[PDB]
């Protein structure tokens, strides 16, 4: 298989406006949302059809209760941080956990927290320690590292449980996650004069597009566009390079996607 990942995010807001929820948790397999929870619905719900059809209602009932507990814990932690920061107003607290099952068979695992969108605490499951960015985080680091058993639990979850969940969800949605739709690639001319290489209609979103001048690639001149969702489950991207009107050169677009290389000579 290709490389696949499972990630769970949490967002806590200290003083949200009337409609906005104070707590949100969403899970992803690769770029696909699989689950969602918020403090307004207070329910754990699937966001992918192959998740709903393969997990019994007991699964959603159990994690609805768990998320309600985790929602309250996240609020308590955010109250502690903003009090130690001596910050007024509304502030955000974020958590990210997940793992990757790489192509060769190896695995990675990660767990991080953020305050106001900036790194706050980062877990190292090999040294069993937390990296703190400031002294508010340093206080939390010392409290979390005093509980050696909790560090060992997080290591086991990242290396064993997370990977096990990923393989399970990978089987559930294999028709979606393990499929391949090759891109359609074209080259246009535009006076910004620059050569535009455009691809669309491909899945997975991972794709590499570069320009080459006379068989040599120089990434300084290449303008890289973002990989964007088209809305139908496929993606599109582009890359541009500016033409030299003072000398003749052979330009070519190179596109790699899912183990297939493509060259369009201009």
């Amino acid at each position, epitope marked *: 298989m290709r490389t696949h990942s499972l990630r769970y995010f949490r967002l806590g807001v200290s003083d949200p406006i009337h409609g906005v929820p104070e707590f949100i948790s969403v899970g992803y397999v690769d770029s696909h949302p699989i689950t969602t929870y918020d403090s307004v619905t207070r329910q754990k719900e699937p966001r992918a059809p192959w998740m709903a059809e393969n997990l019994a209602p007991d699964h959603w009932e*159990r994690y609805t209760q*768990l998320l309600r*507990g985790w929602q*309250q*814990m996240f609020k308590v932690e955010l109250k502690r941080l903003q009090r130690h920061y001596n910050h007024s107003g509304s502030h955000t607290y974020q958590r990210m956990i997940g793992c990757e099952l790489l192509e060769d068979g190896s695995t990675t695992g990660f767990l991080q927290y953020a305050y106001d969108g900036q790194d706050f605490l980062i877990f190292n499951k090999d040294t069993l320690s937390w990296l703190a960015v400031d002294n508010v985080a340093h206080t939390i680091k010392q409290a979390w590292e005093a509980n050696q*058993h*909790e560090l*060992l639990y997080q290591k086991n979850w990242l290396e064993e449980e997370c990977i*096990a969940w990923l393989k399970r969800f990978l089987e559930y949605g294999k028709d979606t996650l393990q499929r391949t739709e090759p891109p359609l690639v074209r080259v246009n001319r535009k006076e910004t004069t620059a050569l535009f290489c455009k691809a669309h209609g491909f899945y997975p979103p991972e794709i590499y597009m570069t320009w080459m001048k006379n068989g040599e690639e120089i990434v300084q001149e290449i303008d890289y566009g973002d990989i964007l969702p088209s809305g139908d489950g496929t993606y599109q991207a582009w890359a541009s390079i500016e033409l030299d009107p003072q000398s003749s050169n052979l330009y070519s677009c190179h596109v790699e996607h899912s183990g297939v290389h493509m060259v369009l000579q201009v």
Partner: antibody
Amino acid sequence: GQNIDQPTEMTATEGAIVQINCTYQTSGFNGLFWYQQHAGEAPTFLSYNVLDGLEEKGRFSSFLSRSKGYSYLLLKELQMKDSASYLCAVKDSNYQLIWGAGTKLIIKP
Amino acid sequence: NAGVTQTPKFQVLKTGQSMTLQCAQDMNHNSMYWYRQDPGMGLRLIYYSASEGTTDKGEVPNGYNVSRLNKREFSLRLESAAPSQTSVYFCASSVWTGEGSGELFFGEGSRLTVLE
């Protein structure tokens, strides 16, 4: 289904060493707890293991093997106060505790 | 520092009688549990409360009901007592639920005998 197994009863002599076994077959694994429960009293927390190896704690030590799915609680230098039931419990993938039936330890003076 | 306090320690009941077991914890814990213990098997969860304001069924909820009155109190209700409900009932609490290494703190237990 999910299953925990430990012996019903063990008898050892005061001052000796006793090893209480616990095997488990569960849906995922998030740790193994040992609890002590004297007759007519509340269970009290003894130890916890998630990774493989032996962890020591006074006269008691707890060992875990995740690949073999088994743990033991090791009591050294047995005293009469050690007479009790010892309960093993495992957290599954959904953080639900599955409890073993307990092992009654009888100490001969 | 009372820990987990549950009452009563003993109670005899007639079939069909109602009964409420009380449980309070002063450890500022968020998660609370109600177990029954029977000879020859492990503890079986009746109901639990992951946090203040929510409860859910356990493994053997039939014949029982609970109320998480506040953060401290978690009562267990037997509305129509049955002979099969003769057991020892333990209430427990932990700091949070879903955290891996968090252990349970048990109350002293309540022994119930239900007679025809």
